[PDB]
Amino acid sequence: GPSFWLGNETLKVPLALFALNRQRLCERLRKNPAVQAGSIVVLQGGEETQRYCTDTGVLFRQESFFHWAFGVTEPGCYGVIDVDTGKSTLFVPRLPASHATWMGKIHSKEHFKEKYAVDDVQYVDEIASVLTSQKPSVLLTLRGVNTDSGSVCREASFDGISKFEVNNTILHPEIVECRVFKTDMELEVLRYTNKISSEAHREVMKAVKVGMKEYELESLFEHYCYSRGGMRHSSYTCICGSGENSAVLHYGHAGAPNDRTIQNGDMCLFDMGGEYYCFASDITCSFPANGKFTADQKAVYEAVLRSSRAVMGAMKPGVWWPDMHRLADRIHLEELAHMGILSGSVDAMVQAHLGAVFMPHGLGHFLGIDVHDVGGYPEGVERIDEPGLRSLRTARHLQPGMVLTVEPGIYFIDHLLDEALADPARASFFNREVLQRFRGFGGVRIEEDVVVTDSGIELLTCVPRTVEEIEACMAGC
Amino acid sequence: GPSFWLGNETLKVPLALFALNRQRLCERLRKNPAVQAGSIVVLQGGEETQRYCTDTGVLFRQESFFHWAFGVTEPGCYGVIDVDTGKSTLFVPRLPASHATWMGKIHSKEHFKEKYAVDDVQYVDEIASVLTSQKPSVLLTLRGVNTDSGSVCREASFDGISKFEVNNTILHPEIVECRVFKTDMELEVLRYTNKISSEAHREVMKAVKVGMKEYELESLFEHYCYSRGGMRHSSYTCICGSGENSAVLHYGHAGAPNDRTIQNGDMCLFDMGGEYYCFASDITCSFPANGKFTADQKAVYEAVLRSSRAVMGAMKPGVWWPDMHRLADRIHLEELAHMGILSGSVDAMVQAHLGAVFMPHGLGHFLGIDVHDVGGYPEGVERIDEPGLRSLRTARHLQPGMVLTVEPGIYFIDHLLDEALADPARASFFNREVLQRFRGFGGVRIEEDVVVTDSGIELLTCVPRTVEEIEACMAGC
Numbered sequence: 001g002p003s004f005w006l007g008n009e010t011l012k013v014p015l016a017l018f019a020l021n022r023q024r025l026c027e028r029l030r031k032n033p034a035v036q037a038g039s040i041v042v043l044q045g046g047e048e049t050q051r052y053c054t055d056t057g058v059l060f061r062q063e064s065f066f067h068w069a070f071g072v073t074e075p076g077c078y079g080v081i082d083v084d085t086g087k088s089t090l091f092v093p094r095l096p097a098s099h100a101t102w103m104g105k106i107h108s109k110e111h112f113k114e115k116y117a118v119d120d121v122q123y124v125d126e127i128a129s130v131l132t133s134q135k136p137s138v139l140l141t142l143r144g145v146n147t148d149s150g151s152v153c154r155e156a157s158f159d160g161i162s163k164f165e166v167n168n169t170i171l172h173p174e175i176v177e178c179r180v181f182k183t184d185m186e187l188e189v190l191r192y193t194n195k196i197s198s199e200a201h202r203e204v205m206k207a208v209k210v211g212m213k214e215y216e217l218e219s220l221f222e223h224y225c226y227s228r229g230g231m232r233h234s235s236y237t238c239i240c241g242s243g244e245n246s247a248v249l250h251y252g253h254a255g256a257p258n259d260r261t262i263q264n265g266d267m268c269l270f271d272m273g274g275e276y277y278c279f280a281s282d283i284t285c286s287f288p289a290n291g292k293f294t295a296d297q298k299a300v301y302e303a304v305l306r307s308s309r310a311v312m313g314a315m316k317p318g319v320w321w322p323d324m325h326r327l328a329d330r331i332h333l334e335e336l337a338h339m340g341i342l343s344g345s346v347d348a349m350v351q352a353h354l355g356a357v358f359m360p361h362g363l364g365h366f367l368g369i370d371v372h373d374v375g376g377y378p379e380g381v382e383r384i385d386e387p388g389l390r391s392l393r394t395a396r397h398l399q400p401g402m403v404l405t406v407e408p409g410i411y412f413i414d415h416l417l418d419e420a421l422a423d424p425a426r427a428s429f430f431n432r433e434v435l436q437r438f439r440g441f442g443g444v445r446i447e448e449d450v451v452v453t454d455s456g457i458e459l460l461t462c463v464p465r466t467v468e469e470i471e472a473c474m475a476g477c
Numbered sequence: 478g479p480s481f482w483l484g485n486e487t488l489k490v491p492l493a494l495f496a497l498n499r500q501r502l503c504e505r506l507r508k509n510p511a512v513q514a515g516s517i518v519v520l521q522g523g524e525e526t527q528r529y530c531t532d533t534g535v536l537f538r539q540e541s542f543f544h545w546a547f548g549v550t551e552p553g554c555y556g557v558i559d560v561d562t563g564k565s566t567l568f569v570p571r572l573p574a575s576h577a578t579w580m581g582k583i584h585s586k587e588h589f590k591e592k593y594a595v596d597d598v599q600y601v602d603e604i605a606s607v608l609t610s611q612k613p614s615v616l617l618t619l620r621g622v623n624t625d626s627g628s629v630c631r632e633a634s635f636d637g638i639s640k641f642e643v644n645n646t647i648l649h650p651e652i653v654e655c656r657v658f659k660t661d662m663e664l665e666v667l668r669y670t671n672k673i674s675s676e677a678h679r680e681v682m683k684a685v686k687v688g689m690k691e692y693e694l695e696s697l698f699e700h701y702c703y704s705r706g707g708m709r710h711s712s713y714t715c716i717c718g719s720g721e722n723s724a725v726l727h728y729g730h731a732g733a734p735n736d737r738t739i740q741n742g743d744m745c746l747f748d749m750g751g752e753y754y755c756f757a758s759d760i761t762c763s764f765p766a767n768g769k770f771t772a773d774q775k776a777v778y779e780a781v782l783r784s785s786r787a788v789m790g791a792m793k794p795g796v797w798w799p800d801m802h803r804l805a806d807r808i809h810l811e812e813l814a815h816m817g818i819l820s821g822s823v824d825a826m827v828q829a830h831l832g833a834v835f836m837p838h839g840l841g842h843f844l845g846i847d848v849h850d851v852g853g854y855p856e857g858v859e860r861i862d863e864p865g866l867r868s869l870r871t872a873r874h875l876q877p878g879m880v881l882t883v884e885p886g887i888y889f890i891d892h893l894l895d896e897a898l899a900d901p902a903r904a905s906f907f908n909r910e911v912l913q914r915f916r917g918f919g920g921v922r923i924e925e926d927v928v929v930t931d932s933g934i935e936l937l938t939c940v941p942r943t944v945e946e947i948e949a950c951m952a953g954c
């Protein structure tokens with residue numbers, strides 16, 4: 001059996017992985033009472049892209065659904081799967097012999113059959129003819145709404161498609177459910193992205209110096225992942241927040257691109273995750289820039305370590321994800337009170353929604369081929385209309401084989417804080433004189449990637465977490 | 478006067494650079510008799526994009542024309558220039574006061590006026606009424622054909638733009654012609670991009686070892702450029718061909734993603750250039766993987782070194798660029814004859830277009846904000862319909878201020894070789910028994926970036942070039 005491999009110490013991923021996904025999608029559609037006999041799944045791969053109107057090629061990364069079904073790295077492909085038999089056909093672009101002048105050897109269709117271990121390979125321009133000869137009942141295409149972006153997924157289309165019966169509602173929720181439940185072969189890849197990203201995080205912690213620019217660490221992190229782990233891409237733009245910037249969720253975008261000089265006294269919050277063969281990792285480490293936690297940083301950090309461990313210790317099949325988020329809120333509030341920042345009844349603090357002031361984002365989300373993976377809110381799973389909870393990327397109950405991030409945080413965000421101090425239903429909880437000490441603290445977030453097993457979780461991530469472990473990693477070790 | 482800067486040893490670029498561009502564009506438009514008084518240039522900035530239908534951010538890189546004119550790093554902006562007066566107005570998006578949580582500091586309009594040194598800043602939702610009160614005769618927008626991609630530039634559009642008179646033919650030829658001639662400020666940025674990429678090429682040469690994967694060198698090059706040079710993007714996808722892949726012109730892309738193991742005996746061809754503040758560099762180095770040229774490798778290498786130095790020596794205002802391409806072709810053929818690969822009259826070889834068998838691409842191209850920069854083929858300049866020369870990205874005569882790549886090379890491409898050996902008008906020049914030993918040699922390209930001065934050229938790139946220099950570099954002398 002063939003495998004994708006970037007050599008050295010990188011992971012061998014069997015193409016069988018994708019055969020299993022195809023097989024699981026078919027099994028799921030045969031069980032579907034409204035999937036007609038003789039149906040055929042028709043997916044379209046992503047295409048080569050350029051910067052606006054220039055000839056500057058953009059690096060091609062495969063469309064995620066298409067990758068999940070076939071594992072194909074080349075642009076311009078299509079893929080069909082006969083539902084009743086499970087037979088797979090890949091369609092590759094016809095490159096004219098003259099292209100060998102600027103390409104290498106132009107690969108034969110047979111080269112692609114053995115590469116991807118699919119049942120047949122044909123040219124893209126013969127798609128209409130090839131599907132005609134199969135006399136299918138219906139073409140199942142991919143159309144639906146991603147619940148993190150709001151975008152509608154592009155449906156496959158080819159010249160001549162109008163002569164076929166096309167159903168575009170059935171496939172989306174089904175191919176999404178398959179993706180939510182990771183196979184053992186998929187887990188092996190997620191273990192590997194986490195291992196490599198964990199090593200990269202360790203290296204950053206070793207190298208950080210007061211005086212460096214944040215992007216120096218971004219650069220180091222991507223160099224390790226690529227050179228040591230074959231990860232050409234990151235799963236998302238690196239967030240390298242130091243000082244006040246640790247309080248900016250999604251910092252490091254074009255408008256704030258990791259350009260701050262790290263200073264003595266700053267907390268660093270680093271959320272960086274490499275991507276191997278279109279599989280994600282998503283890992284955040286928080287640590288003092290100088291290698292020594294102050295009392296205040298120890299206190300806030302250990303509050304987050306506490307919610308992290310309490311959530312992970314409680315996760316198991318049947319657990320409603322929003323319950324864990326509320327747990328994290330409660331623990332934050334408890335500890336924020338133990339440290340003297342808040343006073344009064346934790347119950348009262350909860351009933352007021354104070355938790356959302358300190359952790360305005362969701363506790364965690366599905367992870368897979370996308371960092372924010374599909375299937376958090378299928379039909380019938382409602383968004384909870386409350387501050388904090390409304391940002392959860394899923395409201396599902398945990399089941400074995402799900403892959404989630406566990407990412408609690410405590411931040412000191414000036415405009416959430418000024419709001420609470422202006423709301424008489426929230427103001428009384430604050431001790432202004434101690435709060436003043438934490439203005440500009442930034443934030444801590446501790447983000448693990450876990451798998452939901454039959455009875456608990458498997459922790460994918462391996463970074464130092466306790467105060468002791470972190471101060472030791474930063475000093476060598 | 479304010480400047481773009483990324484700290485450390487990174488280059489300070491004065492925002493005055495872009496004011497000069499706006500000034501120069503206006504002066505050229507004023508001379509154009511089709512341009513009506515009261516005309517306003519309206520450019521639209523690039524927007525934030527995501528991976529297909531997911532919420533995975535793609536790192537924002539500004540549209541080229543817009544950057545040339547304003548140097549704005551933020552997504553979602555417009556920018557207008559009053560032709561008669563030269564006053565610039567930047568339009569920035571109105572971000573709801575309520576998501577400082579996720580963005581950070583919502584910057585006021587004065588911040589941006591200060592930041593970019595424009596005459597005025599307003600919100601984007603106000604663009605129709607801001608323009609309406611200026612009572613323009615005509616809006617000049619940007620539409621044209623890029624002569625490398627064949628793509629049509631996206632013309633600026635906003636809500637209520639159909640109430641204006643809009644012209645979309647005048648601007649493109651004029652803004653392109655300004656981009657062709659680099660100001661002293663632009664040149665300073667280009668010296669820097671070349672300095673940094675040259676330093677990185679030197680590091681890639683000291684680091685190359687047999688048994689490494691090509692992408693390890695790509696990763697290091699990029700890491701030097703980012704951590705050491707502030708270059709978050711490269712100018713194009715790194716080409717790291719070794720062995721037979723050094724003969725593959727479009728190498729490095731998704732379908733051949735630098736995944737070959739560097740072998741003893743291989744030639745390497747590394748084409749890589751970092752990008753700083755959307756300014757490009759374009760450098761190719763060629764060298765033996767093991768750090769030592771064989772006789773065959775030296776002969777071919779010194780053939781390309783010869784034509785590189787000949788072309789650079791010849792360049793001056795007034796020189797027709799296709800004559801330089803021809804001069805490279807003649808030098809290659811001379812050397813390939815001295816080597817025994819060819820026999821007979823070099824004049825006859827030239828008449829038969831045999832040079833394009835060994836160098837199928839153009840000698841070089843304008844370089845600027847884009848690596849294949851705009852303006853090689855404006856009205857009245859035609860593509861020469863002959864092998865090799867048809868691939869030239871410009872057929873213009875050289876003038877002070879133009880920046881070009883000089884990138885001759887020799888490759889052994891089976892498709893081209895086989896075609897030529899079947900043609901009795903070309904076959905006779907080959908010594909097949911000598912040609913044999915060079916099959917699967919790969920190729921060598923030597924690529925320098927230069928500026929045309931009043932009297933000749935200025936060389937920007939600073940890498941090892943002679944056989945002695947390269948071997949001494951690789952041995953870690």
Ligand SMILES: O=P([O-])([O-])O
Nearest residue numbers: 250271282361407
């Ligand atoms: O970014 P995130 O990971 O979702 O928090």
Ligand SMILES: O=P([O-])([O-])O
Nearest residue numbers: 381395396397398
């Ligand atoms: O799982 P669920 O919760 O039923 O969605």
Ligand SMILES: O=P([O-])([O-])O
Nearest residue numbers: 748759838884924
């Ligand atoms: O890529 P290139 O440099 O244009 O050849």
Ligand SMILES: [Mn+2]
Nearest residue numbers: 271282283447
């Ligand atoms: Mn994260």
Ligand SMILES: [Mn+2]
Nearest residue numbers: 282405407447
């Ligand atoms: Mn996450």
Ligand SMILES: [Mn+2]
Nearest residue numbers: 748759760924
């Ligand atoms: Mn190049």
Ligand SMILES: [Mn+2]
Nearest residue numbers: 759882884924
């Ligand atoms: Mn070039």
